[PDB]
Ligand binder design. Structure first.
Ligand SMILES: N#C[C@@H](c1ccc(Cl)cc1)c1cccc(Cl)n1
Lengths: 546, 164
């Protein structure tokens, strides 16, 4: 997901502005749905929500807009159990042998023959939660096992929390209402208000451990790869209690990152650290936020946002609809140079021409250069020490950058990666002169619709994740509900689309209408005032009761 | 009863629900969402009830791409009657009302549907829903940040046998 909130110091009108570009699946239980909810006098909110939920999850009201992105915080911890050396169904805590508990569930299964059989399955549980086996990594042997304690299992506050956000007046009120209830499960919140405040919060439900406990309570090898893993044989590694927290064992709101500014805040699923580089967010629990290199979407956004020029609605819209493959900025200049250095080397000819002709974009009309660039980048990522300038903590915005072609082991490896990528691309059944839009589509009944955008891992702000199905890449998730909100005097002005359309049912009039619009990148008014609603020539109305 | 809503749709089938209270508000949401997505919701509630293998057999997957029988074991474990009852008992009166209105508006669409916008008309899993079903969906989304990412691993967890 991306989010940018702009405030009075940087917007063209001196008021707030919010770009919400969440990235989520195009099917299933997290498929967004647009709606506007009004109890006249005390609620009026519009946005998009998830299946089954009678609250708005991302949206706007008369003076506020807010949105979310998945955070990098931990929302569970794994516990490594020391098993009783006499019995691998018991585990030790402070040297004392405890029995696992067993909970059986019974499932009915429909057979080949159409009849139902019953399958009983035993779930083993420790004081932390259920045990989990990941073969070759988290085993259950005679020495050790892993249990998993999820902090959102006790979060009974999540729906009240979004209903509360739906009733918020401005940024200050939003912050009070989120910090009071701590009901948000696993996303950042970013918002802007009419007064021109821009707010970022990493305010969610995060297992709390006091900082002095972390070094001995961590499992050093597992934390190395970012798994929140704790020592489950020591009772002092239990989540810490603090009576300021809304739920026993979670981090108090005062210890979670928040940034309130009048210029901008942004997040593209990196940690809180560089939400706005003029004010780094530092010093948090490693369960909360760490200073890691930022991915290419955030680098792209920060490259467009930094500086002193005003930001117009149009500028934020175009950061999405440009489909620029920002990862190309880091490697393609050096790559084309390798190409020039190897002319008439015939394995590389088609690849190098596609790359030089490429507009560096994931547009419907973008050339096959994008497909060569992707398969090359998949390989470049698995190479060691190939960056001309590697990640530099002191220049987190401009590094890594460039290919180390001045190191012969790299030039040989990079050339080989490009030959292997080019072979893969040529072995697939891509026509001559085919564009990105001829390949990446969303199926709608017996037809297909071309979809612009590409994987967020290549720095495309308009992130679109696809999978091979027959002769095409089929879109499965990415840009979903789009809302871009400003606050002119008459009432909030919101523009966007729901990329996959309102209805997942092929019979609906609203199965693909916004998808056709998304293909052509033509955003629309999101009508909110009764004046906007009444101006709509497709307006329909039904009143119902029972 | 005491459920009422006024629903306006603008271009692209975006509903605008007006009601005097949370029950009527939920009634309009549930009815408008069902018109567009009754089949999707029924499917996801089947998953969250752990009844995939019962309607579809062990050979298929949920929309999260888990096998039906491990997915069912996970959601039967997650959404046990005592967990749902404690979650319900912790809801505010307003949220309770939102949810009761939603189930009743969804069921009202289903009572009347003739297939105009509902491709799964007549399937045995397209059924009236209850507030507990919407708590099952809620819990399923809560744990997608956590134990839900380890659903297969939970199902696989079995103690060692005699091996070396
Ligand atoms: N956190 C979180 C989850 C989330 C989790 C639980 C519920 Cl009930 C509602 C939302 C989320 C998912 C998708 C989109 C958003 Cl905005 N938030």
């Amino acid at each position: 997901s991306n989010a940018i909130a702009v405030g009075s110091e940087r917007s063209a009108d001196g008021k707030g502005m919010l770009l919400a570009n969440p990235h989520f699946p195009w099917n299933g239980a997290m498929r967004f749905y647009q709606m506007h909810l009004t109890i006249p006098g005390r609620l009026d909110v519009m946005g998009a929500s998830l299946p089954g939920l009678p609250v708005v999850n991302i949206g706007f009201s008369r003076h506020l807009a807010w949105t979310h992105t998945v955070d990098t915080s931990s929302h569970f911890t794994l516990y490594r159990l020391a098993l009783d050396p006499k019995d691998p169904r018991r585990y030790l805590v402070d040297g004392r042998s405890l029995p696992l508990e067993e909970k059986s569930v019974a499932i009915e299964v429909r057979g080949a023959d159409g009849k139902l059989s019953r399958v009983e399955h035993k779930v083993y549980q420790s004081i932390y939660g259920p045990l989990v086996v990941w073969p070759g990594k988290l085993d259950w042997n005679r020495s050790e096992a892993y249990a998993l304690r999820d902090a959102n299992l006790e979060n009974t506050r999540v729906l009240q929390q979004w209903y509360s956000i739906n009733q918020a007046s401005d940024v200050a009120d939003l912050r009070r209402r989120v910090e009071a209830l701590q009901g948000i499960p696993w996303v950042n919140t970013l918002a802007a208000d009419e007064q021109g405040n821009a707010l970022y919060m990493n305010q969610s439900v995060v297992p709390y451990l006091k900082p002095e406990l972390i070094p001995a309570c961590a499992i050093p090898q597992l934390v190395a790869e970012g798994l929140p893993a704790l020592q489950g044989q020591d009772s002092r590694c239990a989540w810490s209690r603090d009576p300021a927290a809304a739920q026993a064992g979670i981090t108090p709101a005062a210890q979670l990152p928040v940034l309130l500014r009048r210029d901008f805040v942004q997040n593209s699923n990196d940690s809180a650290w560089l939400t706005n580089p003029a004010s780094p967010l530092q010093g948090f629990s490693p369960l909360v936020s760490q200073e890691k290199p930022i991915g290419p979407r955030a680098r792209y956004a920060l490259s467009r946002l930094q500086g002193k020029q005003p930001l117009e609605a149009k500028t934020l819209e175009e950061m999405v609809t440009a489909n620029h493959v920002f990862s190309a900025d880091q490697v393609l200049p050096d790559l084309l140079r390798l190409c020039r250095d190897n002319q008439g080397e015939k394995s590389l000819a088609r690849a190098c021409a596609a790359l030089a002709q490429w507009d560096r974009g994931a547009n419907l009309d973008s050339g096959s250069g994008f497909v060569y660039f992707q398969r090359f980048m998949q390989r470049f990522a698995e190479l060691d020490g190939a960056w001309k300038e590697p990640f530099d903590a002191q220049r987190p915005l401009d590094t890594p950058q460039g290919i180390a072609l001045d190191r012969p082991q790299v030039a040989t490896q990079v050339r080989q990666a490009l030959a292997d990528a080019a072979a893969e691309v040529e072995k697939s059944g891509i026509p001559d002169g085919a564009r990105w839009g001829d390949l990446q589509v969303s199926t709608r009944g017996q037809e297909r619709i071309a979809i612009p955008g590409g994987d967020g891992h290549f720095g495309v702000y308009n992130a679109i994740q696809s999978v091979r199905k027959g002769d095409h890449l089929e879109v499965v998730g990415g840009t979903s509900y789009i809302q871009l909100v400003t606050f002119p005097e008459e009432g909030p002005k919101a523009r966007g689309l729901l990329a996959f359309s309102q209805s997942s049912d092929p019979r609906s009039p609203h199965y693909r209408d916004q998808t056709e619009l998304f293909s052509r990148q033509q955003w629309q008014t999101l009508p909110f005032s009764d004046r906007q609603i009444d101006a709509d020539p497709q307006l329909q109305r039904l009143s119902i009761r029972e | 009863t005491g459920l009422a809503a006024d629903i306006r749709w603008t271009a692209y089938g975006v509903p605008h629900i007006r009601a005097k209270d949370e029950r009527g508000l939920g009634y309009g949401i549930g009815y408008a969402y069902a018109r567009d997505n009754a089949c999707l919701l029924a499917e996801e509630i089947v998953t969250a009830r752990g009844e995939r293998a019962r309607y579809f057999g062990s050979e298929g997957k949920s929309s999260a791409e888990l096998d039906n029988l491990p997915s069912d074991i996970f959601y039967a474990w997650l959404n046990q009657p005592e967990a749902l009852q404690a979650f319900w008992q912790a809801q505010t009166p307003a949220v309770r009302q939102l949810l009761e209105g939603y189930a009743a508006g969804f069921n009202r669409f289903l009572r009347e549907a003739d297939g105009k916008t509902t491709s799964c008309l007549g399937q045995p899993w397209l059924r009236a829903i209850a507030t507990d079903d919407l708590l099952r969906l809620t819990r399923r989304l809560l744990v997608e940040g956590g134990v839900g990412q380890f659903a297969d691993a939970l199902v696989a967890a079995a103690p060692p046998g005699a091996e070396k």
